[PDB]
Each structure stands twice: as structure tokens, then as C-alpha cells.
Amino acid sequence: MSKTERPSRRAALLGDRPGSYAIARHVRMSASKCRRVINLVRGMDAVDAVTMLKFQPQAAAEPIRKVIASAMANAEQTEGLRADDLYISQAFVDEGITMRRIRPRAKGSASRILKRSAHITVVVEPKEARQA
Amino acid sequence: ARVKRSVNAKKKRREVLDQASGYRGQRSRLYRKAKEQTLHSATYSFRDRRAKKGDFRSLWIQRINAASRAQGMTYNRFINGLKNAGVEVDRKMLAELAVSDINAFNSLVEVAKASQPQN
Amino acid sequence: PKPTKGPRLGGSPAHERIILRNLASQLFEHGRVVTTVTKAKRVRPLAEKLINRAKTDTVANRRFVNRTITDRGIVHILFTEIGPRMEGRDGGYTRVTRIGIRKGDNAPMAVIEVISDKVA
Amino acid sequence: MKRTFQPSNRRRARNHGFRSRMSTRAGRSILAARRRKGRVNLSA
Amino acid sequence: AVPKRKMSRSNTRHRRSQWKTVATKLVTCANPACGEKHLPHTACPSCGGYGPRGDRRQVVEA
RNA sequence: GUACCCCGGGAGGGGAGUGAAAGAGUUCCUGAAACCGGUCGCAUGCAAGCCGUCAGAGCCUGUGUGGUGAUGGCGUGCCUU
RNA sequence: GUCCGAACCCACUUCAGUUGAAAAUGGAGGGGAUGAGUUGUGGAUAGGGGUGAAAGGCCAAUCAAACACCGUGAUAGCUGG
RNA sequence: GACUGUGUGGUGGAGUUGAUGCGAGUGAGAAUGCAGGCAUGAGUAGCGUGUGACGGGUGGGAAUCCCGUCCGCCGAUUAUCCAAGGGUUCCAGGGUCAAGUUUGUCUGCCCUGGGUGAGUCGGGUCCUAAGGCGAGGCCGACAGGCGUAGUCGAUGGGUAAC
Ligand SMILES: [Mg+2]
Ligand SMILES: [Mg+2]
Ligand SMILES: [Mg+2]
Ligand SMILES: [Mg+2]
Ligand SMILES: [Mg+2]
Ligand SMILES: [Mg+2]
Ligand SMILES: [Mg+2]
Ligand SMILES: [Mg+2]
Ligand SMILES: [Mg+2]
Ligand SMILES: [Mg+2]
Ligand SMILES: [Mg+2]
Ligand SMILES: [Mg+2]
Ligand SMILES: [Mg+2]
Ligand SMILES: [Mg+2]
Ligand SMILES: [Mg+2]
Ligand SMILES: [Mg+2]
Ligand SMILES: [Mg+2]
Ligand SMILES: [Mg+2]
Ligand SMILES: [Mg+2]
Ligand SMILES: [Mg+2]
Ligand SMILES: [Mg+2]
Ligand SMILES: [Mg+2]
Ligand SMILES: [Mg+2]
Ligand SMILES: [Mg+2]
Ligand SMILES: [Mg+2]
Ligand SMILES: [Mg+2]
Ligand SMILES: [Mg+2]
Ligand SMILES: [Mg+2]
Ligand SMILES: [Mg+2]
Ligand SMILES: [Mg+2]
Ligand SMILES: [Mg+2]
Ligand SMILES: [Mg+2]
Ligand SMILES: [Mg+2]
Ligand SMILES: [Mg+2]
Ligand SMILES: [Mg+2]
Ligand SMILES: [Mg+2]
Ligand SMILES: [Mg+2]
Ligand SMILES: [Mg+2]
Ligand SMILES: [Mg+2]
Ligand SMILES: [Mg+2]
Ligand SMILES: [Mg+2]
Ligand SMILES: [Mg+2]
Ligand SMILES: [Mg+2]
Ligand SMILES: [Mg+2]
Ligand SMILES: [Mg+2]
Ligand SMILES: [Mg+2]
Ligand SMILES: [Mg+2]
Ligand SMILES: [Mg+2]
Ligand SMILES: [Mg+2]
Ligand SMILES: [Mg+2]
Ligand SMILES: [Mg+2]
Ligand SMILES: [Mg+2]
Ligand SMILES: [Zn+2]
Secondary structure (H helix, E strand, O other): OOOOOOOOHHHHHOOOOOOEEEEEEEEOOOHHHHHHHHHHHOOOEHHHHHHHHOOOOOOOHHHHHHHHHHHHHHHHHHOOOOHHHEEEEEEEEEEOOOEEEEEEOHHHOEEEEEEOOEEEEEEEEEHHHHHO | OOOOOHHHHHHHHHHHHHHOOOOOHHHHOOHHHHHHHHHHHHHHHHHHHHHHHHHHHHHHHHHHHHHHHOOOOOHHHHHHHHHHHOOOOOOOHHHHHHHOOHHHHHHHHHHHHHHOOOO | OOOOOOOOHHHOHHHHHHHHHHHHHHHHHHOEEEOOHHHHHHHHHHHHHHHHHHOOOOHHHHHHHHHOOOOHHHHHHHHHHHHHHOOOOOOOOEEEEEEEEOOOOOOEEEEEEEOOOOOO | OOOOOOOOHHHHHHHHOHHHHHHOHHHHHHHHHHHHHOOOOOOO | OOOOOOOOHHHHHHHHOOOOOOOOOOEEOOOOOOOOEEOOOOOOOOOOEEOOOOOOEEOOOO
16 A cells, blocks of 8 residues: 555665666667676776777667766765766666657568667766675 | 456466466466467376385385395295285385384395294 | 789789779888788788889889889989988888777778888 | 559549539539538549 | 477576676776776777877877 | 756757646546566576466575476367367 | 661660569660661550550559449358367 | 345446336347457567678667768769659758667658749740530430531740840
8 A cells, every 4th residue: 555665766776776877768879789798897996987988889788878977966966975986786678668660661561660768877886886 | 238258257367377387488387388288287296196106115115125135035035934924014114114214124025034934 | 022822802813903002102102001910911012112113213114013002202202201211221211000899890900001100 | 554543633533523522413412422521522 | 490498597697697798898098197997909098198108199189 | 738947959858837636747537458568586508388277496585375387207289060 | 667886765685683672673795776676745445344566464562353332240061169 | 947135355436236017129159240359370470682891979778860981883874953742751950669571879751940033934814726615506305416607726836035
């Protein structure tokens, strides 16, 4: 029966632990193509991650880098943490709204095209939490 | 009085998906595929609850054979000796004796040896 | 110089010849040029051949260089500035340095540039 | 190639136009049926 | 040819997990005044320079 | 119908406000399944598997029952016709 | 209703295409090319009817009887559920 | 047994339980069933004939926008202007969700405002062809068919500017 301690993203992802997070919803790119870079960036130091993503050749690097920077700023503002002692504790990509489109083909047929989208979530905590 | 099927329909689906909650692939995710395996699961369980008697009797008989052959007596002669001596301890208690109380099993082996027809 | 072994730039060997000649001309015009890794590394031998031919200034040599390039202004630049700049250099008149990649197509980019400082 | 529809406004108006439909009793009944259905385009 | 049957989750994931990329390595700029990370054998995008602490020739005007 | 502040070109998010409720934020009541993921436990790289079933060690858990399952036996889908 | 040959009209061979660039085309050749030629605009002929240098050809991308609606929820000793 | 607890939580926010009757659009896994959503193949095939290079600019972001210079291509047409058809796509400014087979700061896209001036040009106000309609009329059970006098109908005639 609805009441107090209502669920929240911070409670689910951190749960009274120090740190912050950031979500980029409706990123106009495929979830799998975002995961291809999320898998690399997960678990790294935040500054190292953003510096690397400035050089990562995939197009998914830019949105993920911006999300990590936003999470870093949120942590620095709401918990007094510094950017250089944060590490990416969690990182995942869920699927967002997909648009159906039509590509005409030979002999009057029409083939379905799926324009996919992704939600990117990054959770950054102080590096001292790594061995906790 | 139009009736919507969903509230009544989901009950058997929840039952079957619960019954199939360790299966691999579609068999634990999809109701239709889980339903087919639950039929096979029920048939196998019924068959195996009756084959279990024979499986455990075979295990007991093998253990009794090993324990009695350790005393220089085959299983058939051992069982015939017990039957003639009139000791109705069954394959199960005999196997438990063989594993646990080897001295009591050996005493029973001596009883069977003495009760042999010697012919 | 040595041919390109594999498939040619620009979808045709004739277009590759045109591309390499124009790229060498633009290199001589501007001193340096950002022209991706393969184009720079393929234009380097031709550009150094041309610079070496221009190191000694005769009318016949200027005509032979004008066989390539074909912009007499660039020929004048090559025979007046680039040429005398390499009086003591025994080859190696150009250098190539990687820059990064292009966002659009991930082409590895590099700048090729004529040596500026005097060897002496 | 050359497809079935080759537009011609004059031919279209002569064929399926309002006056063409009104000329014959079949066309008038067609206009009445389209009015009953509620078409915004009674004719071409 | 056409796929005869829908591939299982295990096999689909076995094949799909191999579609990945390696992380770009990055190296610290030799220029003490820059100290930034750049690609190996590549001019530093920040300082626009190349070479060891000594040489340090400008490559990119940035 | 989210003032103001922060990261961001934006989109989006993080604080804060409004509200009984914002994980009711306009794609907005409730929010199921297929489907896609993060984390944790166990198993798995000498193995021939209608994918289950019976026997069963070990590990995890003990919220002292549950999760997992090495290994042995047995075992050729559903419907229609 | 001559000859060679562009435009133009055609569609003989071959290769490619054949989830095509294209629900009939493209490349290379090929036939006619002052004539029973070709083409623009408008018009006429309508379904047991049209038209046909005749192939049952064509009549709005499937014509041994067009398409649409209606009789109509046609009927089916058959197949499926 | 179909199923279920008057056990205990979570979510949720306005109805509904038991007894006993009454009435059913009362139960789905199959119909190459219907609608929607989503997997599989797969980050695979394809991205529709081709030649682009470079310097500079703009920008959060540039192979794909702007400017310039080289270079290449078409040229009985890759030029220019009409008819048919389309209908605001034209111009200027703002924009980058969508659309564009990639990117995009760009657009034939979106938004806002603006833009088409004729005594002579092309049509009507003039003329008729094919053909259509057709006062009376003749024909036909009805419905209708045909047609006179007429009246329309360009693809033609007539008609004054460079
Ligand atoms: Mg409840
Ligand atoms: Mg088509
Ligand atoms: Mg034996
Ligand atoms: Mg060779
Ligand atoms: Mg290529
Ligand atoms: Mg040539
Ligand atoms: Mg048509
Ligand atoms: Mg395999
Ligand atoms: Mg309340
Ligand atoms: Mg809720
Ligand atoms: Mg929704
Ligand atoms: Mg909701
Ligand atoms: Mg092993
Ligand atoms: Mg075998
Ligand atoms: Mg002739
Ligand atoms: Mg023509
Ligand atoms: Mg033929
Ligand atoms: Mg063929
Ligand atoms: Mg002839
Ligand atoms: Mg007509
Ligand atoms: Mg015949
Ligand atoms: Mg036809
Ligand atoms: Mg018939
Ligand atoms: Mg009837
Ligand atoms: Mg029937
Ligand atoms: Mg059949
Ligand atoms: Mg009742
Ligand atoms: Mg029903
Ligand atoms: Mg169903
Ligand atoms: Mg469907
Ligand atoms: Mg897929
Ligand atoms: Mg690949
Ligand atoms: Mg394949
Ligand atoms: Mg392939
Ligand atoms: Mg390919
Ligand atoms: Mg092309
Ligand atoms: Mg291009
Ligand atoms: Mg230009
Ligand atoms: Mg030319
Ligand atoms: Mg000429
Ligand atoms: Mg107009
Ligand atoms: Mg407009
Ligand atoms: Mg428009
Ligand atoms: Mg415009
Ligand atoms: Mg795009
Ligand atoms: Mg624009
Ligand atoms: Mg504009
Ligand atoms: Mg008049
Ligand atoms: Mg007349
Ligand atoms: Mg009359
Ligand atoms: Mg008149
Ligand atoms: Mg007139
Ligand atoms: Zn540097």
C-alpha cells in the first residue's frame, strides 16, 4: 500500500552511499551500439573515461562522455566530491522508443526499418568505494 | 453480459510458468513451450516414481553382493541362506547394515552360511 | 616512383595520378597540407623526387618539373624557395605526422610538410 | 515505363465531372449515394 | 539460403558478444606544459606538438 | 504544467519548488507478457544434450528453506490427420 | 511499303539483374528508319460486349468473359479450426 | 482436479466480498486465423552509373554547409525556354525532433513573413473540325434511342510591340 520511502533512482542505484548519477533518455542511437562503448567505459575512473571517450572512434562515445561529465558535475555539486577521485561504479544502456519507417524495395515491396533509441545511465562513486 | 478472458486466463499460465521455473530457453519463459515440457515432466515423474523402487532395490542388491562377496559368498547363496534361516530382513536394511554395521552384516553372512543346504 | 601495389586512390589509376600531382602541387604551394595518412605517404616520394630535381636550377630542369605540377607559379616557388632551402639535404625534404581521425568517416589524418629549417 | 495514369484535367473533368455525372440518371444516383455516405468530394 | 530455425538465446549471445571494440590507449604528452593525453605517434590535440621533451616541433596550430 | 540553480549546443538529467502522491512531469491513471539490460549467487572451456525427469555430491544461503548443480539412470516435441 | 545509317520506333541474341536502379529494365550488339512510318492533343466503340495485319491478344501492373457494389453470411458429400 | 487461503507483504487508488438463486458475448495453443507489440536472421546485405583535392570560414560538433584555388565531367545536352502535370516547392530570415538510404551548421524539409502587375504574350470575350448535347420532332411497354433548327467543343483558322 503506497506510503513513505517511495522508490527513487538514487535509492535503487546508490542507497545512502556517496556519489551521484546521470541519465540520458531518448538518445537517438541504438542500444547495442551504445553498449559497445558502455562495456569499455564501465568500472574506469571518471576523468580517464572522459579523456578516453574524447578519442574513442565510435559515435556512441559522445553521448556517453556527456553523460559521464554530467554525473561527475552532479556528484561535485551535491556531495562535495572531486572529479579526480570518482570512478564509474555502474553503467548501462536500456532501450527507448523505436520508430517504424518504410524502405521501398524491388518489385513494389516495402521493408520495415527500425530507428532505435537508448537510455544511458552512469553511476559514479568515490574511488574509496571500489574495495567496499 | 460481455466477459473479458484475461483475469481467468492468466491463472493457468502463472501456474505453468511457476512449474517450469528452472527450464532452459523458451521452456521457462513462454507459456506454450513450458506447457509442453510440463506434460513431459509429469509423465517422467510418474514413470520415475515407479522405477525408483527398482533403482533402489538394484542399488541395495549390488551393495549386498559386494559385502557378501567380501566374505566369500555370492548374493544368490546369501539370500537363499537368509530365506532358509528365516530371517526376513529386507534388501534396504541389509544394504544399510553392509555400509554401516559391517560386523552385523558379517554375522548375518555366517547365519546364511550355516543355513545353506550344503548340497 | 614505385607503383601503389594495391587499388588506386580515387577509384581509378588515372584519377590517382591526378590526385597525387595536385596534392604535390598544393604541398609546394602551402608548405604543409593535411591530407590523410595514405595520400600523404603516397605523395611523399613524388614530392621528394620533384624537390630533388628542383635543387639544381636549369631551364631544362624547370621544364621537366613543369611536366608535373604544370602551375608555373608553383614551379617558381619550388625552384626559388624550396630548392635552395635544401642545398645540403641529402633527401628527406618532407615529413609526415599523424593528427587523429575524421569524425565523419574515421579516416586517419596526417599533415605532410616540406622541411622548413636549413640543414646548415 | 509508361504507366496507367497519364493526367489530363480536361479529360478528367469531362469524364468524372459534376456535369458529366448529372447528365445521366446513373450519375445522379451516384451523386445521391455519395451524398448519403457523406463524401466531401461528390465528383471529380 | 534462409535461416531454418530461430537461433537460441545461448547461441545468439555467443555470437553477439564478439561484436566489441578495444579501448583507445592514449599516451601522456611529453610537453611538461601540456601533460595531456594523446594518441601514440600522433600530435597532441591540446598543445599541437610532437616529439620528445627536447625536440617538441609544432604540428597542429591548435 | 516544475520559478531559480548546476552539467549540456540542445535533448536529457541533477538539486529545488508545486502537490496527498512527480517512479501522477504532459510519451503523464493503473502499467501485465513477449523483448532488452545492470548487479549478485551457483554451474559451465574432454563435451554427443526433445533440454526434462529420478538419484545425487559440492558450493551459496540459511530469510535453517531456498538457489545452483558436478555426476549416474531413464527418456525421440505439440497439434492435426 | 529502295539502300547505308543517328534521332525516333522496335525488341533478335547475349550477359547482368532477378528481396532488381526497375512488379519486365540496364550494358553490348541487333530490325525499321518517306512509310502498311512515328508521335502530341481532343474525341468514338463497354463486358457475352468492344477491339483484334488473329496471339484467345488487348480493354487501367494477373481477361477462355474487366472492375466495383449488391443478391450474400452464395454453395462446397471437401480441407482446416 | 479445474483451482485456491478468512496467511502475509509490495504496487495501486475506488470499489467490491460471502451465502443462495437467476442470466451468459463464460474459459484458447494451434484455423498458411485477425490486431498490436517484440524477437530471429544481424550489427549481417544494401546505402540506387560517377572524381575529387586543398586552403580558408562558420560552428558545441564538418569528408559530406559556405568562400576560394587547382582538377575532372556534360555540352544535339548534366545547357536554356515552353506545353502537359504538379501547387507555393520560389525569395528572405529563424530552426535541426522528424524527413534526406551516412553526417549535416545544409535542403526541394519545418516555422514566420514576403513574392506572380499585360489593350498587343498564352486562353476567354471571335470561328468552326472530330465529337458531344439537343427546342420541337420521330422511335421505343416504362426506363430510354436517335436526331432537325440550333448550341457547344482545339489539337486548327482569326487576331495590334519591340
Ligand atoms: Mg491487496
Ligand atoms: Mg514501382
Ligand atoms: Mg553386478
Ligand atoms: Mg604492381
Ligand atoms: Mg573505395
Ligand atoms: Mg585516361
Ligand atoms: Mg491508370
Ligand atoms: Mg555454435
Ligand atoms: Mg491521503
Ligand atoms: Mg508507482
Ligand atoms: Mg508509454
Ligand atoms: Mg503510467
Ligand atoms: Mg572439465
Ligand atoms: Mg551415444
Ligand atoms: Mg526503306
Ligand atoms: Mg520519345
Ligand atoms: Mg523475346
Ligand atoms: Mg539470366
Ligand atoms: Mg531494309
Ligand atoms: Mg473519351
Ligand atoms: Mg490456341
Ligand atoms: Mg493489363
Ligand atoms: Mg461466365
Ligand atoms: Mg438468397
Ligand atoms: Mg460454408
Ligand atoms: Mg489436409
Ligand atoms: Mg453470487
Ligand atoms: Mg468466447
Ligand atoms: Mg493467447
Ligand atoms: Mg501480427
Ligand atoms: Mg535483431
Ligand atoms: Mg563487420
Ligand atoms: Mg550471415
Ligand atoms: Mg558479410
Ligand atoms: Mg557490404
Ligand atoms: Mg554513387
Ligand atoms: Mg559524394
Ligand atoms: Mg566549391
Ligand atoms: Mg569533357
Ligand atoms: Mg557539333
Ligand atoms: Mg501556376
Ligand atoms: Mg513556405
Ligand atoms: Mg510542401
Ligand atoms: Mg528555396
Ligand atoms: Mg540523418
Ligand atoms: Mg539551414
Ligand atoms: Mg533557408
Ligand atoms: Mg457567339
Ligand atoms: Mg457538329
Ligand atoms: Mg425534348
Ligand atoms: Mg455561333
Ligand atoms: Mg467556343
Ligand atoms: Zn600536449
